[PDB]
Amino acid sequence: QLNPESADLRALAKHLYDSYIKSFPLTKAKARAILTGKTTDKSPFVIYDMNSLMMGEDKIKFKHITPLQEQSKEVAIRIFQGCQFRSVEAVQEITEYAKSIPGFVNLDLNDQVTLLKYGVHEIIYTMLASLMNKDGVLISEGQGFMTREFLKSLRKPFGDFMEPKFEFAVKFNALELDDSDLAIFIAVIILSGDRPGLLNVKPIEDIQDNLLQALELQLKLNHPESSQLFAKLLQKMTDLRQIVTEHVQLLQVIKKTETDMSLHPLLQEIYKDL
């Protein structure tokens, strides 16, 4: 029965979950509630083509999304500008979450930065899965839903950015994880220790050990019938890396085909020598 040690690991879990809800406006629970439509008040406006996209701007928010524009001959780029600024915002959120992880702020400032530098995108694609289903992704805080088929057409350089995310999403979602799980998983991810350039690895590893211990307990307590979910979830981390590198390769292509498109310093500092 309940051990004194597992007692500490549950508190850590409740803490991270609590911090997660506090740091992320749109949880997986709200996303699913919107997608599985158990509502008449949360249904999103669907974008699957230009006209609906046109209607989209009309029916929903997002002008704050993409700033430097009156438009631009291309929808493909306009969308890119949006997903770009929104990533900026996610780093911001993830960064606020990191600070709540016990021990993270007590680490060397240079290592805190490197952990975020590499962990940010692996985290972004994990959570992005929460907003997806095999047919599309929620947008503008849940008010919209852009179809997977619209995105895959977009163009030639851009109709290839999201497919790998859906690929991972459909599979990662198969694990049926909920917010309380993801909160700890997201923590492990940031607290790697094998991140290129860490000055002091040991302290990071001890924090992760503990976080790994919290996740293990949490996964078995929340999914008793799910055999080896822990091991199965960890293996998923390799799918996140390929998403990342496959993405960077894509970005580099953008930097040449679109010399007129501005990116974003933050995202650039993140990618710089990644």
Ligand X SMILES: *C(/C=C\CCCCC)=C1/C(=O)C=C(SC[C@H](NC(=O)CC[C@H](N)C(=O)O)C(=O)NCC(=O)O)[C@@H]1C/C=C\CCCC(=O)O
Q: Is 271 annotated as a binding residue?
A: yes
Which among 36-44, 138-146, 217-225, 231-239 is the span making contact with ligand X, rule CB under 6 A? 138-146
Asked if 257 touches its own copies (CB under 8 A), the answer is no
Chain positions 43 to 102 lying near ligand X, rule: CB under 6 A, are 62, 65-66, 79, 82-84, 86-87, 89-90, 93-94
User: Is 80 a known ligand-binding residue?
Assistant: no
Q: Is 223 annotated as a binding residue?
A: no
Residue 8 is a binding residue for its own copies (CB under 8 A) = no
Site for ligand X in 211-240 (CB under 6 A): none
Report the partner that residue 189 touches, choosing among ligand X, its own copies, none (CB closer than 5 to 8 A by kind). none
Interacting residue with its own copies among 69, 228, 252, 262 (CB under 8 A) = 228
Residue in the block written with tokens 């999403």: 169
CB of 206 to ligand X, least distance (A): 25
Q: Is 84 assigned a ligand-binding role in the annotation?
A: yes
Binding site for ligand X (CB under 6 A): 26, 62, 65-66, 79, 82-84, 86-87, 89-90, 93-94, 123-124, 127-128, 131, 137, 139-141, 161-162, 267
Q: Return binding residues for rosiglitazone.
A: 84-87, 121, 247, 271
